Symmetry: D2
Subunit: 134 residues, 4 copies
């Protein structure tokens, strides 16, 4: 449980599926959004992706490779590997597994911005400090 | 085309379906949201449901009776009957049809609010004036 | 563990909100589906809303009143009251609370069907014996 | 009508946004799915992503870069560039513009499959003859 902040688990529900009977594009975002939110909560102690009126996180890039399908009722495990690319950027890599078998892998790059001017902004030292602890 | 502001048509797409192969709960909201937005645009000339920083519309109540299923690729027609219940409230009744055959009917009650205090607020006369014209 | 099948807790997420800063129409479906799904699992011990190839639950009617908004981060408690209307239809009444104040109330009505012919069907006694308790 | 199959226009809706006041991850799927669906209809004359019981398209990989945000009400133009990678896989590259400035770029890769066995399958010549034009 030492790395538990990097592990998120849940089941595929009706609203994660479309008529092809497999999880859909937006369902993977719920899964990886839940994983990043927990991580930040437990590692940093702050809300995500809206931290405050002067600091938000927005997605600058996204990628996913869907190796295998996941169906309604599958218990998924998501594994997170955050990489701090700068005082403005984080790549959250993730893997999705069913019973230890990889189904999906990808990443999202998020940028810290001050939403009032809507430009990128350097993350406070407190947050960087928390983020550097494995 | 005189009542065209009350008529909205579109097809059911992949993302309106879940694994039961029929349109899902949120897909009807896209359909009825598109219908109300067009109506307000053409009848009133303003954006919806966020009109400005001092005036928004939020849903206070909703109802739907789903008589028949709609499937991927169905061309749906939505018919709107707005009833102005007060200077603060509108019931947007709707019907959904496939080839003239009713599939769905319901309503949403929307309230005008000033979001800065988050309380109900009376709609300007200009808007009421526009809304009263059939 | 008194009435624990009937109580579900959840938290408002970024994907539950729209630009009005509050939970949107589909979010409430997320909440009540989770509540109903959990109830069925614990009380009947079966999957929901697709039980098997011959037995599905489909929504016939939905209703909600939104007394108060819920926002990103709020924790919520859904209370369920299943009402068995017939050998084949259930009305799942629900309330949403926040810090123990009522924010939302509603119901969905669900009907058991055979999806191969798409007509409603009596719930098996297996299932009805278990639902009939409590 | 030069390259009209490749151009799609859409508008950002309330259901395309989250509490950050901008279009969210799934919204972009809404846009590019509509773009791809329209292209397939006009170029090949078939439904997408479910062509028939023996032929579906499923996403194998997705990628996007979000240069600029889009907001509620913005009109958008999606530009499509289909690249045929094999007898069974297509890479649908896309750009999103707003007031003719680049906001977003990406691709999804789609594979033709038989869903009854769930293995990839060569696209029929009917379909490939039509896709191969332009
Ligand atoms: C259908 C599926 C199993 C593919 O089945 P398969 O036939 O066993 O897959 P293969 O690995 O043989 O792929 C077939 C071809 O596609 C190619 N392919 C797979 N991924 C590719 C990609 N990312 N880019 C380009 N080509 C790709 C393979 O190289 C192979 O090429 P080939 O013509 O040289 O043989 C697929 O992996 C799948 O079900 N993925 C799940 C998709 C999903 O759930 N999508 C969710 C989107 S939200
Ligand atoms: C499956 C469906 C066709 C019902 O099929 P059916 O068997 O032909 O339907 P019936 O009209 O005979 O309904 C069966 C029973 O349910 C009852 N019922 C239907 N709607 C009801 C409701 N709103 N409240 C209470 N009971 C209801 C009927 O009165 C009937 O009662 P009975 O036991 O006295 O015979 C259903 O109408 C349907 O497919 N609706 C589409 C649902 C859908 O697309 N849901 C989308 C949700 S987002
Ligand atoms: C904004 C909100 C608090 C209303 O604030 P309020 O100032 O207390 O508004 P009121 O309760 O006095 O109601 C406004 C008026 O419309 C009427 N009204 C409210 N709900 C109604 C309903 N469901 N049907 C018909 N009329 C209704 C009221 O009677 C009142 O009329 P009145 O002044 O003549 O008495 C509202 O309850 C709310 O925030 N709801 C939650 C919105 C939400 O989260 N939903 C969207 C998610 S899908
Ligand atoms: C806020 C926004 C304009 C960035 O503003 P900006 O101040 O110009 O930020 P920059 O372009 O200088 O990039 C910020 C930093 O992160 C880096 N960065 C940006 N995108 C990156 C990416 N995709 N991968 C790795 N690093 C990246 C930049 O190189 C820069 O680092 P630097 O200062 O060392 O050069 C951003 O482009 C944006 O609004 N994107 C749209 C967000 C959105 O709508 N997406 C969510 C919907 S799903």
């Amino acid at each position: 449980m030492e790395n538990i902040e990097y592990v998120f688990e849940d089941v595929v529900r009706i609203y994660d599926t479309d008529a092809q009977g497999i999880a859909h594009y937006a369902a993977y975002y719920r899964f990886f959004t839940n994983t990043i939110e927990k991580f930040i909560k437990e590692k940093v102690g702050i809300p995500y992706p809206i931290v405050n009126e002067n600091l938000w996180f927005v997605i600058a890039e996204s990628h996913a490779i869907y190796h295998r399908p996941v169906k309604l009722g599958d218990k998924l495990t998501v594994l997170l590997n955050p990489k701090i690319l700068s005082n403005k950027t984080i790549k959250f890599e993730f893997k999705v597994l069913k019973d230890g078998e990889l189904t999906t892998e990808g990443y999202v790059i998020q940028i810290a911005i001050n939403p009032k001017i809507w430009k990128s902004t350097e993350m406070p030292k407190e947050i960087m400090d928390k983020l550097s602890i494995k």
